[PDB]
C-alpha cells in the first residue's frame, strides 16, 4: 500500500469536486493527485454524480 499525502494547495482547491478530498502518492519518485470521492460520485475529478 502506498501512503497518501496532502495535495498542493491549487490541486487541493479545484481538483477535486463534489466534496471530494485530494489526496497525493509518489510513485517511482513522480506525484500522482488523485480524487477520493464522497459516496454516489465517480470520475477523475468526482465529476460524474454516479
Not at 490541486?11 to 470521492?37: G, Q, T
Request: hydrophobic share 35%.
Amino acid at each position: 500500500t502506498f501512503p497518501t499525502y496532502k495535495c498542493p494547495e491549487t490541486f487541493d482547491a479545484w481538483y477535486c469536486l463534489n466534496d471530494a478530498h485530494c489526496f497525493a502518492v509518489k510513485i517511482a519518485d513522480l506525484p500522482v493527485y488523485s480524487c477520493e470521492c464522497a459516496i454516489g460520485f465517480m470520475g477523475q475529478r468526482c465529476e460524474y454524480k454516479e
